From a paper:
DNA polymerase μ incorporates nucleotides in the non-homologous end-joining (NHEJ) pathway of double-strand break (DSB) repair. Error-prone synthesis by pol μ often introduces mismatches, as well as short deletions or insertions, at repaired sites. Pol μ is expected to frequently encounter oxidized nucleotides in its biological roles. We employed time-lapse X-ray crystallography to obtain snapshots of 8-oxodGTP insertion by pol μ on a model DSB substrate.
We grew crystals of pol μ in complex with a model DSB substrate containing a single nucleotide gap with a templating C (Ct). We soaked pol μ-DNA binary complex crystals in a cryo solution containing 1 mM [name] in the presence of catalytically inert [name]+ (10 mM) to obtain pol μ-DNA-[name] ternary complex crystals. We then solved the structure of the [name]+-bound pre-catalytic ground state (GS) ternary complex of [name] opposite template C ([name]:Ct). Arg445 forms hydrogen bonds with O2 of Ct(anti). The nucleotide (Can) and catalytic metal (Cac) sites are occupied by [name]+. Metal coordination occurs through conserved active site aspartates 330, 332, and 418. The triphosphate of [name] interacts with Gly320, Arg323, Lys325, and His329.Fig. 2 [name] insertion opposite adenine and cytosine.
Numbering used by the authors: 138 to 364, 384 to 397, 410 to 494
The structure:
DNA sequence: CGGCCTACG
DNA sequence: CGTA
DNA sequence: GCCG
């Protein structure tokens, strides 16, 4: 089993779901305390289990697996022997974990803001609503829409939404295209938000496009919240039987020269892309982001026409999106 | 021990 | 600071 | 928390 997640296929569904979900609780709790290193180790250990071909049934089967040291191994052992890990359950019911999770789920609130509110004594959404001068415009929108935004977006919702975006994009710039990215491109049947990548086949024509798209969506009454730019993090009105619901939608524009890098980055998963960028820099000496792949010794950018090109540049076997669920 | 992804709004 |  |  290789040490980087980008070196192994990771399917969406697998054979160690309960074990991985426990390690991801500990990863999340580490993030809430500001230890990104521990978060990464727990995430990586969880992802190793997702990549295995069958269930872990005995502690012996962790020997030699990367990212399983004394702590992650003890978590798995307790789950194998008792069906529960006391450390995980203590985290689950802790006031700190529950409130930090509640607050960071608000659009416009990160770990740093949630922690400050926690230290001030706040614990509930109604606590926040009773002091709204304390809130940015973004946070106000995230709090007002929190209930709808907490409900998963169904893959069955997405095609009708993509059609609406395509209509606005085609008026803004005929010939421009819309590609579904994010977890839905990896095969998920639900998601917390929808991610779209927009480009045009003629290099340079995409300049200035996103403000034109947003203006047209707003004029159609579809934008509940937004605001030169190339990424937009929106709240959209999605139809429902007899009504509608708020949904988070991300829009990104890339020039066609960069489209394979943007498609790769925005298709994720988040851990897969962090691991891929870490691999590129530490193992290959190349710097990767959603715009390109840079050789800092030649001071040259790799041209890519496809995601396949990028995997080849990096010396990695190609993984389709459905196998990037690290 | 150092390092832990890398951007844009 | 927020966001992907 | 773990790798190298
Ligand atoms: N490099 C990098 N990419 C990120 C980061 N956060 C998100 N992304 C990329 C990869 C994600 O798959 C993609 C979309 O992010 P989302 O939060 O929408 O996640 P995703 O669609 O995978 O899942 P979800 O909507 O929760 O089902 O953006 C980050 O911190 N770093
Ligand atoms: Ca998103
Ligand atoms: Ca998403
Ligand atoms: Cl840490
Ligand atoms: Na080990
Ligand atoms: Na948030």
């Amino acid at each position: 089993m290789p040490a980087y997640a980008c070196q192994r296929p990771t399917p969406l569904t697998h054979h160690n779901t309960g074990l991985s979900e426990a390690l991801e609780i500990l990863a999340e709790a580490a993030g809430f305390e500001g230890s990104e290193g521990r978060l990464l180790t727990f995430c990586r250990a969880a992802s190793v289990l997702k990549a295995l071909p069958s269930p872990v049934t005995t502690l012996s089967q962790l020997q030699g697996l990367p990212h399983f040291g004394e702590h992650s191994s003890r978590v798995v052992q307790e789950l194998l022997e008792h069906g529960v890990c006391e450390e995980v359950e203590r985290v689950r019911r802790s006031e700190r974990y529950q409130t930090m999770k509640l607050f960071t789920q608000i659009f416009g609130v990160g770990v740093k803001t949630a922690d400050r509110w926690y230290r001030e004594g706040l614990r509930t959404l109604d606590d926040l609503r009773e002091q709204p001068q304390k809130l940015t415009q973004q946070q106000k929108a995230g709090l007002q829409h929190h209930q709808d935004l907490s409900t998963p977006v169904l893959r069955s919702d997405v095609d009708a939404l993509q059609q609406v975006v395509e209509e606005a994009v085609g008026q803004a710039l005929p010939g421009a295209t819309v590609t579904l990215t994010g977890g839905f491109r990896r095969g998920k049947l639900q998601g917390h938000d929808v991610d779209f990548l927009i480009t045009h086949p003629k290099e340079g024509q995409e300049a200035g496009l996103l403000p034109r798209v947003m203006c047209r969506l707003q004029d159609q009454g579809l934008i509940l919240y937004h605001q030169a730019f190339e990424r937009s993090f929106c709240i959209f009105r999605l139809p429902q039987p007899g009504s509608w619901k708020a949904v988070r939608v991300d829009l990104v524009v890339a020039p066609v020269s960069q489209f394979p890098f943007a498609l790769l980055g925005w298709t994720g998963s988040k851990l897969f892309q962090r691991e891929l960028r870490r691999f590129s820099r530490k193992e290959k000496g190349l710097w990767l982001n959603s715009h390109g792949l840079f050789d800092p010794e030649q001071k040259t950018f790799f041209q890519a026409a496809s995601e396949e090109d990028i995997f080849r540049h990096l010396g990695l076997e190609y993984l389709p999106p459905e196998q990037r669920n690290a």
